[PDB]
Amino acid sequence: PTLHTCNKTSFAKAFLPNETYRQRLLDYIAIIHQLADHASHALKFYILSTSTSSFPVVHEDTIEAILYLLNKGEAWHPRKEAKKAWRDCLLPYVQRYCQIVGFIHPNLRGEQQSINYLTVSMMTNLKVNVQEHFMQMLLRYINLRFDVKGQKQRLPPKSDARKAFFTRLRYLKSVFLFDVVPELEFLDDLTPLESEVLEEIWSLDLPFLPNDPLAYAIVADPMSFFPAYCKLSGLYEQYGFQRFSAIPLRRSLIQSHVRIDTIILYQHILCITRRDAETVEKDDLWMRVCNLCTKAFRSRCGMHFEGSITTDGASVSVYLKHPEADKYKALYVENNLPACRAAENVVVIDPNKRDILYCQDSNGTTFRYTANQRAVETGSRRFAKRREAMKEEAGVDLIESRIPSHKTMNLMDFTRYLLVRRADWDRRKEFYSHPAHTRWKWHSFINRQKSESDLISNMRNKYGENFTVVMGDWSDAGRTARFQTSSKTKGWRTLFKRNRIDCFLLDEYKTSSVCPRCSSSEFVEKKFKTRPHSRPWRRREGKIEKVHGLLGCTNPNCLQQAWTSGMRYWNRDMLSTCNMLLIVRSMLDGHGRPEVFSRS
DNA sequence: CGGTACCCGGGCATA
DNA sequence: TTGATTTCATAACCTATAGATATGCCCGGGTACCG
RNA sequence: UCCGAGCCGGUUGUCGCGCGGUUCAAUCCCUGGUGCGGGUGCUAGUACCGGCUCCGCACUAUCUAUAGGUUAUGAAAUCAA
Ligand SMILES: [Mg+2]
Ligand SMILES: [Mg+2]
Ligand SMILES: [Zn+2]
């Protein structure tokens, strides 16, 4: 739904200073964490075990049955007919998995509430993974087998006659993907290399829709594509391609957040009979453990604190549930011109990798937010070196790095991964049991939250209390270019909304190749200065980096007789912002986007 | 000392 | 003698998806009652 | 495999400028922010109220898990003996 909000808080403030209640929380979280970790591995183990027959269909009952068997073994006595069949089917494999990993049944009481949350959560991961990444992996497999990486050199670009492969590839993809029915005569033109691809893709047993393409079939029923998706991963390992985790695994040993609701509260925390809870108000139960008077539990926007929290022993996530909720190009500046004209001040931002934000007003005031500032303010860089030092001090790297790949689909290979993981499981848990690992995640949230708040506060001082942000449309929806650090591009579109700041998108086409002072894209030079590589390890290699953020104009109008360089130097980020002001100003004035910056 | 019926709590179902 | 290219493990940052609890009924085991 | 930000110049609205100078500001523990007050604290300018620091209270902040890409660390394989 879309009627919930969360106010994260620390463990100390969330829970009252009661040692008995606090100890149960940590003990309960650890038990649930183990079940979630082993259940995911158990789910994959069952799938791999049956790989030599019809693929087993995975439903909510399948994951739920595994969780109960691990916790209760044979003591689980479901009455649903469907669950009974899965219990017997999964029982031989669950016991076998425990032998490999040495798991011992905790026999936790009142598992149902935790089981249901984990069951849905684990089931969600399968749906999400198949829905989005199924198309990406299948398309990648077609490209890899055709050596599209090497086709760049074999068929050099900038030639018309060499588009045959690209045209050939596009036609084959439609036929292979079954989106378009091929001509029956085309089968005689298949090359031996392409012939194998057609048969291999057919073996995936990809579903079909009589009137819709795969783009809609996957969304309609992602679970139907799960059996094909698992076999697709096997093909990647069969030819050395970069493997992907088709079956999600909760590998991390750090205590994960485990949801604690009203029922779990009396079941395990308060340890009182169900009658004691049924006869007492829901708010009263939580007040005995959690300090509801704190800021985190306060209501907001008509959303009250219905009992639900996820904690990991260092931080607590307090959720607010709206009463009306179930009990259980529109963002571009072009289409929002009427609102922009009413803005007190308009700010244009050109995101980049290093200069994550570079803002400029109509008056020319300059402000920027750099990734280095996040590295210091957020503390991620500090938490990086220190994390490595602890790993080296405890000698976990010597053990952690040798773990066999978990993405393998072969049963024998996966068995080795479990054995190696068990080989040094005891040592690693002691290392990850340190409070620092969970402390860093909570501290990162505070520093990251504090850094974002400071960013908005600084912008308000320079740009006023209320302002409208017109950011460039460029953004990385994942798949960030290699050799470049991660950066926040689409996230800023959400941060402004949380702070009651309107955000709009603008096209950046040709915005970096126009001199604002003469409005001409002809006399512009790019990447003329050179110097040793700024990266210390690349500099030792002797590499030379051509300047990227420096631009200049050779037009006589911009030059002066007293100069010796012969160019009016400009900054890439600042130059882009200046062009945006001209583009935005023209559109606001009714003249539209200038032809200089148009895709003509 | 030896059999029967009512109630409490844990478990499981499913919207 | 020496250094260049692929894959994998553990953290993180963004980025995209989905779900973001509760009431009713079974049963079995402990007890109270009767001879 | 290492870096904070603003400003005065070398600049002309110039560069991961490992160019100079200059001011703050984070180095651990902390959920952040807007405002309407009073007070068990410490700070600078000519008693007034510029700075952090607390409660008490209206509103304002979605997060967990998984996965793709990427970054840091640690490992495996090949080509010339
Ligand atoms: Mg841009
Ligand atoms: Mg830029
Ligand atoms: Zn010019």
One DSSP character per residue, A306-346 reads -SEEEE-SSEEEEEEE-TTS----TTBGGGGHHHHHT-S-E
Same domain, A153 and A276: no
Same domain, A80 and A9: no
d(Cα A164, Cα A155) in Å, to the nearest integer? 10
| A444 within 8 A of A378, measured Cβ to Cβ | yes
Q: Taking Cα atoms as reference points, which of A15, A592, A558 lies closest to residue A337? A: A592
End-to-end CA distance of chain A: 43
Same domain, A175 and A316: no
The answer to whether residue A372 sits within a structural domain is no
Q: Taking Cα atoms as reference points, which of A48, A40, A51, A187 lies closest to residue A125? A: A40
Range(s) of the domain holding residue A158: 30-248
d(Cα A597, Cα A510) in Å, to the nearest integer? 6
Integer Rg of chain A from CA: 29
Distance A370 CA to C28 C1' (A): 67
User: Strand A530-532 relative to strand A544-546: parallel, antiparallel, unpaired?
Assistant: antiparallel
Same domain, A115 and A231: yes
Residues 6+ apart with CB under 8 A from A265: A277, A285, A286, A289, A307
**Residue A351 Cα, ligand 2 centroid: separation in angstroms?**
6
Judge whether A350 is annotated as a binding position.
Answer: yes
Q: Residue A352 CA: which ligand is closest?
A: 2
Method: cryo-EM
CA atoms within 13 A on the CB side of A366: 8
Q: How many CB atoms lie within 10 A of CB A290?
A: 26
* Mutual angle of helices A60-72 and A81-101, in 10-degree steps: 50
Distance A113 CA to D48 C1' (A): 63
Environment of ion ligand 2 (residues, CB < 5 A): A 350, 352, 572-573
d(Cα A60, Cα A55) in Å, to the nearest integer? 16
Single out the residue in A269, A300, A328 at which a domain terminates: A328
d(Cα A269, Cα A462) in Å, to the nearest integer? 50
Judge whether A179 is annotated as a binding position.
Answer: no
Query: Phi/psi at A502 (nearest 5 deg)?
Result: -70, 140
**Residue A374 Cα, ligand 1 centroid: separation in angstroms?**
20
| A386 within 8 A of A414, measured Cβ to Cβ | no
> A459 by DSSP, 3-state: which?
helix
| A466 within 8 A of A371, measured Cβ to Cβ | no
Judge whether A558 is annotated as a binding position.
Answer: yes
Q: Taking Cα atoms as reference points, which of A196, A61, A31, A166 lies closest to residue A122? A: A61
Residue A237, both tokens: 């390992």
The answer to whether residue A480 sits within a structural domain is no
A321 touches strand C (CB under 7 A): yes
Q: Taking Cα atoms as reference points, which of A90, A48, A100 lies closest to residue A68? A: A90
Same domain, A243 and A261: no
> A256 by DSSP, 3-state: which?
coil
Q: Taking Cα atoms as reference points, which of A464, A475, A466 lies closest to residue A332? A: A475
d(Cα A352, Cα A393) in Å, to the nearest integer? 37
User: Which residue's C-alpha is at the least distance from the C1' of D72?
Assistant: A384
Residues 6+ apart with CB under 8 A from A555: A515, A518, A520, A522, A523
A68 touches strand B (CB under 7 A): yes
| Amino acid, single-letter form, for residue A81 | E
Same domain, A299 and A192: no
Same domain, A242 and A261: no
Residue A131 burial (10 A CB sphere; 0-12, 13-18, 19+): middle
d(Cα A477, Cα A488) in Å, to the nearest integer? 10
Distance A412 CA to D62 C1' (A): 42
Same domain, A239 and A142: yes
Residue A143, both tokens: 């490209």
Q: How many CB atoms lie within 10 A of CB A353?
A: 15
d(Cα A128, Cα A281) in Å, to the nearest integer? 37
Environment of ion ligand 3 (residues, CB < 5 A): A 515, 517-518, 553, 555, 558
Specify the nucleotide whose C1' lies closest to residue A72 (CA): B11
Residue A368: C-alpha distances to residues A22, A415, A483, A484, A569 (Å): 44, 51, 23, 19, 19
Residues 6+ apart with CB under 8 A from A270: A21, A276, A277, A285, A288, A289
**Residue A576 Cα, ligand 1 centroid: separation in angstroms?**
7
> A573 by DSSP, 3-state: which?
helix
| A38 within 8 A of A10, measured Cβ to Cβ | no
Angle of CA points A507, A511, A515, to nearest 5°: 155
Residue A201, both tokens: 């893709």
Strand order in the sheet with A468-472: A366-370, A355-360, A346-349, A468-472, A503-506
| A597 within 8 A of A579, measured Cβ to Cβ | yes
Specify the nucleotide whose C1' lies closest to residue A79 (CA): B12
Distance A303 CA to D52 C1' (A): 34
The answer to whether residue A21 sits within a structural domain is no
Give A534's DSSP letter: S
Can you say how many angstroms the Cα of residue A403 is from the centroid of all Cα atoms in its chain?
24
A327 touches strand B (CB under 7 A): no
The answer to whether residue A345 sits within a structural domain is no
Same domain, A128 and A157: yes
Specify the nucleotide whose C1' lies closest to residue A371 (CA): D4
User: In this structure, what is the dihedral angle of CA atoms A77, A80, A84, A85, given to the nearest 10 degrees?
Assistant: -170
A442 touches strand C (CB under 7 A): no
Can you say how many angstroms the Cα of residue A335 is from the centroid of all Cα atoms in its chain?
29
| Strand segments (E) across A285-426 | 308-311, 315-321, 346-349, 355-360, 366-370
Q: Taking Cα atoms as reference points, which of A61, A70, A75 lies closest to residue A119? A: A61
**Residue A566 Cα, ligand 3 centroid: separation in angstroms?**
12
The domain total for chain A is: 3
d(Cα A160, Cα A292) in Å, to the nearest integer? 70
Residue A551: C-alpha distances to residues A351, A355, A512 (Å): 17, 16, 9
Q: Taking Cα atoms as reference points, which of A51, A55, A484, A414 lies closest to residue A245? A: A414
d(Cα A308, Cα A324) in Å, to the nearest integer? 17
Residue A323, both tokens: 């009463």
d(Cα A535, Cα A514) in Å, to the nearest integer? 29
Residue A470: in which H helix or E strand, if any? Answer: strand A468-472
Specify the nucleotide whose C1' lies closest to residue A11 (CA): D31
The angstrom resolution of this structure is 3.3
The answer to whether residue A193 sits within a structural domain is yes
Helices assigned H by DSSP within A164-213: 164-176, 192-203
d(Cα A377, Cα A138) in Å, to the nearest integer? 40
d(Cα A245, Cα A229) in Å, to the nearest integer? 10
Single out the residue in A328, A359, A386 at which a domain terminates: A328
Q: Taking Cα atoms as reference points, which of A105, A113, A108, A126 lies closest to residue A60? A: A126
User: In this structure, what is the dihedral angle of CA atoms A87, A88, A93, A95, given to the nearest 10 degrees?
Assistant: 80
Query: Phi/psi at A12 (nearest 5 deg)?
Result: -60, -45
Same domain, A214 and A265: no
Single out the residue in A328, A350, A378 at which a domain terminates: A328
The answer to whether residue A71 sits within a structural domain is yes
Distance A31 CA to B6 C1' (A): 37
| Amino acid, single-letter form, for residue A585 | R
d(Cα A27, Cα A313) in Å, to the nearest integer? 10
The answer to whether residue A397 sits within a structural domain is no
d(Cα A208, Cα A179) in Å, to the nearest integer? 9
Same domain, A115 and A85: yes
The answer to whether residue A447 sits within a structural domain is no
Residue A566, both tokens: 């012969």
A390 touches strand C (CB under 7 A): no
Can you say how many angstroms the Cα of residue A546 is from the centroid of all Cα atoms in its chain?
32
**Residue A563 Cα, ligand 1 centroid: separation in angstroms?**
29
| A4 within 8 A of A303, measured Cβ to Cβ | yes
Query: Phi/psi at A260 (nearest 5 deg)?
Result: -120, 120
d(Cα A165, Cα A150) in Å, to the nearest integer? 12
A332 touches strand B (CB under 7 A): no
Same domain, A275 and A145: no
